[PDB]
Amino acid sequence: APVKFVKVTRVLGRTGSRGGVTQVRVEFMDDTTRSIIRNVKGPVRENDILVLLESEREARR
Amino acid sequence: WSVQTGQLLDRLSGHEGPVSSLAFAPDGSVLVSGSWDRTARIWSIFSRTQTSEPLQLQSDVLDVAFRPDSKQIAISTLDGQLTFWSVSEAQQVSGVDGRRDVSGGRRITDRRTAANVAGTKNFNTIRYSMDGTCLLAGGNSKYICLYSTTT
């Protein structure tokens, strides 16, 4: 399980569902192009470096 | 008021005196009020919490100007002093006492001397430049006063 650092561009306003879970737009940090959207618990803003595990997650609510 | 409706959206509280400089951020997330309650005020309207964040100042706020990137703001206050404030984490970063820099002295019907008139020793209006480096500052006086921000 290699660790992939990652950061944030957009905060996805009207989508985020089921409680305080913020869904967020994510631009990868080592290769600064590949951008997936991830599910984030807790307070998160733009320009905020997130640490994610295995990136084979394409799901939402 | 709201332009795309036409009505009055709110009237907002908080000040103990006539608010004397208003400025939105060029981002447009923060309104800033500067009032004769010797205070300024961060008005965070647009989110779900129309919250305030006061800036206890020393004297009657004459002016408020934004850095063209919205991370820093300047207020003129009636001493004659300018001061510089972070906006995200609200905290004074710097300040000028410009009382001697602005004294355009001795109108007629002054039986007081030129350098003793309080009333030419304050900045009515301040702006930043488009880079965000120098300020214009000016009052009821003869000298326009061009400061900087970093030094």
Binding site: - | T49, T51, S52, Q56, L57, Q92, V93, S94, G95, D97
Partner: protein
């Protein structure tokens, strides 16, 4: 014809006067010296303006502080506000005007509560 400056400091209810005159380095708080007031664990917060500004700025002045009201903590904040305003005010009126602005820059770059006390009102949320 002396070089005298009166200066106040505030917290919740603790108010402190400090008179700063042309002296030889002492700071005395209610008669006792400054390193003896305010039980041990907060004297660093007493000393904070001294070791920001440097003792070389203080080796020519005398600061006499009376403190009344409040609890221990509020008396500490009232003292340190009276220290900082005392030296900024003495350097305002007696030594040159540049050195005032430099001292205000050092104190404000540390914490503005050394100069302007911001008392808390309440928040009746909308």
């Amino acid at each position: 014809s002396v070089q005298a400056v009166q200066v106040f400091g505030k917290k919740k209810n603790a108010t402190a006067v400090a008179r700063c005159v042309q002296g030889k380095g002492l700071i005395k708080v209610n008669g006792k010296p400054l390193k003896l007031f305010a039980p041990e664990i907060l004297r660093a917060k007493l000393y904070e303006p001294i070791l920001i500004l440097g003792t070389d700025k203080f080796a020519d002045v005398d600061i006499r502080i009376r403190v009344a009201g409040g609890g221990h903590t509020s008396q500490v904040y009232a003292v340190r506000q009276a220290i900082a305003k005392s030296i900024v005010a003495y350097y305002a009126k007696y030594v040159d005007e540049h050195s005032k602005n430099l001292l205000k820059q050092e104190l404000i770059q540390f914490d503005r509560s050394l100069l302007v006390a911001d008392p808390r009102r309440c928040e009746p949320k909308k």
